[PDB]
Design a protein around this ligand. Structure first.
Ligand SMILES: C[C@H](CCC(=O)O)[C@H]1CC[C@H]2[C@@H]3CC[C@@H]4C[C@H](O)CC[C@]4(C)[C@H]3C[C@H](O)[C@]12C
Ligand SMILES: [Pr+3]
Length: 387
């Protein structure tokens, strides 16, 4: 009867992902209008990222302290505002500022949004909702740059920011009068000292952190492409919106097929085995991605095909290693998730930044090498983590 409330959060999750996944393809348009350089294409994703790990930590224990409903809305409100208040910045120096504050609307999905379902809805109820909100994080980056390439053709870029402010409103007016709250730390002290100390505790966990990083490092060459897959292909390799949007699928359609097997071979194998099971393709992915652009700088096909191996493997291994890293520290779910959030993004954010220049002054070589760097890193934190 009240299954309309999860779907509203489902929608809010949907919008925030495409809000980044339809934007990176049509960032060129926005660069060739605001005028700075194609080096500011990925640096969209980057400031969108670096917002998420601002109050990531503080929003969880915060949505606890003063209700879940008014903080969640301060986020849905905070999204639609900067979804239309960025259309009136018009310069690239402060497009960042409004892109960045659109990235803080990311803490709200997990640290309070996800937490509202873990509080109210019960186990088997929560399962199908999370099985849903894991496909949102899979379909909205899969098909988002495909609508984001059929949107810049029939309309301008601006049509997106209206469509998101509106879809976040279809959810927001569905949450205006249909959002019950379950925060139990009402009327509690402004205890800020306790967080840093207790996050430092999970920070002390040389099995968890080294395992939290290795989640970052592994899933980065995935995000470093997404942020640069436009100006790698459109301007870099000089291909159209149908040809570049064609290369998004062999990658993604390989990640989906690695999340097909995972949930199927979750049974016949151990979690411990799956990470090493899905690790060989990842190793062979970034092995052959950059073992392509060796002498042949511009055989993007074999790079994208190499990011189809690597991508299949992220479906399986990376997803497994999530849990074990949660349970690598026998501590609170809220503190660990936030701690591995704020660690994965710092790998993502500043990982791309280096990943950017990796592409400039080197081209395609250096970039893919500063990919296999990360497969090396993750692997090098697997010889630690299991054996
Ligand atoms: C739980 C956070 C939400 C907090 C945040 O905004 O970062 C989300 C955001 C990004 C998510 C990850 C994206 C990459 C991965 C894709 C895999 O095929 C399935 C597991 C992974 C590892 C995901 C697991 C998890 O669902 C994450 C870490
Ligand atoms: Pr505590």
């Amino acid at each position: 009867q009240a299954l309309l409330f999860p779907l509203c959060l489902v929608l809010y999750t949907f919008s925030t992902y495409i809000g980044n996944m339809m934007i990176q393809p049509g960032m060129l348009a926005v660069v060739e209008q605001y005028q700075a350089g194609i080096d500011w294409v990925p640096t969209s994703m980057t400031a969108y990222l670096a917002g998420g790990m601002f109050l990531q930590w503080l929003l969880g224990p915060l949505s606890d302290r003063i209700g879940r409903r008014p903080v969640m809305l301060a986020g849905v409100v905070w999204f639609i505002v900067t979804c239309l208040a960025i259309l009136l910045a018009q310069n690239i120096e402060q497009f960042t500022l409004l892109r960045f504050l659109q990235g803080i609307s990311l803490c709200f999905i997990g640290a309070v949004g996800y937490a509202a379902i873990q509080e109210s809805f019960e186990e088997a109820v929560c399962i199908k909702i999370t099985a849903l909100m894991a496909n949102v994080e899979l379909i909205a980056p899969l098909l988002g740059p495909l609508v984001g390439a059929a949107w810049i053709h029939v309309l301008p870029w601006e049509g997106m920011f209206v469509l998101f402010a509106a879809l976040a409103a279809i959810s927001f007016f569905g949450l205006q009068r249909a959002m019950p709250e379950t925060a139990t730390r009402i009327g509690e002290k402004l205890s800020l000292k306790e967080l840093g100390r207790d996050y430092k505790l999970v920070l002390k966990n040389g099995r968890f952190v080294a395992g939290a990083l290795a989640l970052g490092f592994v899933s980065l060459p995935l995000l470093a492409w997404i942020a640069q897959s436009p100006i790698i292909i459109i301007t870099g390799e000089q291909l159209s919106s149908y040809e570049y949007g064609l290369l998004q699928v062999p990658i993604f359609g390989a990640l989906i097929a690695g999340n097909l097997l995972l949930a199927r071979l979750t049974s016949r194998r151990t979690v411990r085995s799956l990470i090493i099971m899905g690790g060989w393709p990842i190793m062979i992915g970034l092995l052959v991605a950059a073992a392509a652009t060796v002498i042949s700088s511009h055989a993007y096909l074999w790079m994208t095909a190499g990011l189809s191996i690597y991508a299949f493997g992220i479906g399986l291994a990376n997803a497994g290693l999530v849990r074990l890293t949660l349970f690598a520290s026998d501590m609170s779910k809220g503190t660990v998730s936030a701690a591995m959030g704020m660690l994965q993004m710092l790998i993502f954010t500043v990982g791309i930044e280096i990943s950017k220049h990796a592409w400039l002054n080197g081209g395609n070589g250096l970039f893919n090498l500063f990919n296999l760097v990360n497969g090396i890193l993750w692997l090098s934190l697997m010889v630690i983590f299991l054996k």
